[PDB]
């Protein structure tokens, strides 16, 4: 038996935009979770329905490792029951979510003098996402009663927007890399 490929998830060179969040299915491996919790560079390590130091003593069918990049003051939205731009239109967790949310500042990697415009998020959406739903549609958002016909304009807005991370932004607008570990009923 081999270790779980958490290195490929946590230490990946590039993360995904939050609207197109990546998911890594983890199976057939052994994982030391309490070593992950003692990692000080993890600015956030919040678990729900389970204490972190108890994960090493439990087995589960599959573990899902979701990762993406958001801004600093959006990290609070990555939790069960949260509302707002990210939790409602980009990445939503169920209310009965069982797992841990891990985040750390990635200003040295995902910020760029002059702006890093590769990371995007959905700003306009008609209804909320279902938990663990990934919406990558780029259809023009209709804000009035007139149809847009795929053309931007008044009451017709492109749904995605770039973050434009700069190294000189405050921590609230600096990039943070997030890894959400969900446990489905690996030990």
């Amino acid at each position: 038996t081999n270790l779980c490929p958490f290195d490929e998830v946590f230490n990946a060179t590039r993360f995904a935009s939050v609207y197109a969040w990546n998911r890594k299915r983890i199976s057939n491996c052994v994982a030391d979770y309490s070593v992950l919790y003692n990692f000080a560079p993890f600015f956030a390590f919040k678990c729900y329905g389970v204490s972190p130091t108890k994960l090493n003593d439990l087995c589960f069918t599959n573990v899902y490792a979701d990762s993406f990049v958001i801004r600093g003051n959006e990290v609070s939205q990555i939790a069960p029951g949260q509302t707002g731009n990210i939790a409602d239109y980009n990445y939503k967790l169920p209310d009965d979510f069982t797992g841990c949310v891990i985040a750390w500042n990635s200003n040295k990697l995902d910020s760029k003098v002059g702006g890093n415009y590769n990371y995007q998020y959905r700003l306009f959406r008609k209804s909320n996402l279902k938990p663990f739903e990934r919406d990558i549609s780029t259809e023009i958002y209709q804000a009035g009663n007139k149809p847009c016909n795929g053309v931007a304009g008044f009451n017709c807005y492109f749904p995605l927007r770039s973050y434009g991370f700069r190294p000189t932004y405050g921590v609230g607008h600096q990039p943070y890399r997030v890894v959400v570990l969900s446990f489905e009923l690996v030990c």
């Epitope: 003051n73 509302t83 409602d88 959406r125 209804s127 909320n128 804000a143 009035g144 807005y157 607008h173």
Partner: antibody
């Protein structure tokens, strides 16, 4: 003309209730970020409440637990339910469509709320 | 919490002069998340500029904005009579937040 037509303002005694309305024409309330922004006499604008097109609501700390923002899709109208009104709630209340990155482009004419005995 | 401070509280200039209005944020925020508004006395506010520097639909050429991080600026190149009003900047966090506002009056 794209407008936001407001009504419902009036005289409320301290501790009383009042419901403001904001009838849109030229945009769909159901499909937009919508704000309520008030302005006490002689003072600046204060954001009060926000509702997402998806249903999520947000409130300023000064109105938490007392105000409630809502809408009726069939009437294309935004609402602000105000309970336990205090004297400092006296202001001119505006509704506005919010495009966030494009600013609040459409503004209501305002409706006046006066809290007095 | 973030805070938006506008200075000066009152700006006294003559028609045709160059107006510079400061809006300071307590935290370094992206330029796409800042807007300016105008409000004449007795009237509702109107959107002047969105995303720090983009001029709103119908806003005359003389209005311009710039800045980044914590310091933002609204510039009026040549004040007209209708331009003497109160101007508010507004930042987008988890919710909108307005500055205190700056009144531009006529100097005589």
């Amino acid at each position: 003309e794209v407008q936001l037509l407001e009504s419902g303002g009036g005289l409320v005694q301290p501790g009383g209730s009042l419901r403001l309305s904001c009838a849109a024409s030229g945009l769909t309330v159901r499909s937009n970020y919508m704000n309520w922004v008030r302005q006490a006499p002689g003072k600046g604008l204060e954001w009060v409440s926000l509702i997402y097109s998806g249903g999520s609501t947000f409130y300023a700390d000064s109105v938490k637990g007392r105000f409630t923002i809502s809408r009726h899709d069939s009437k294309n109208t935004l609402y602000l339910q105000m309970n336990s009104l205090r004297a400092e709630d006296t202001a001119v209340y505006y509704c506005a469509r919010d495009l966030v990155v494009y600013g609040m482009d459409v503004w209501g004419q305002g409706t006046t709320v006066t809290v007095s005995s | 919490d973030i805070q938006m401070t506008q200075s000066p509280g009152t700006l006294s200039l003559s028609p045709g002069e160059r107006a510079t209005l400061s809006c300071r944020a307590s935290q370094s925020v992206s330029s796409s998340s800042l807007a300016w508004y105008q409000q004449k006395h007795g009237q509702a506010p109107r959107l002047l500029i969105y995303g720090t520097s983009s001029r709103a639909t119908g806003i005359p050429d003389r209005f311009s904005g710039s800045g980044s991080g914590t310091d933002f600026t609204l510039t009026i190149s040549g004040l007209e009579p209708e331009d003497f009003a109160v101007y508010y900047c507004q930042q987008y966090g988890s919710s909108p937040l307005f500055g205190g506002g700056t009144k531009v009056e006529i100097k005589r």
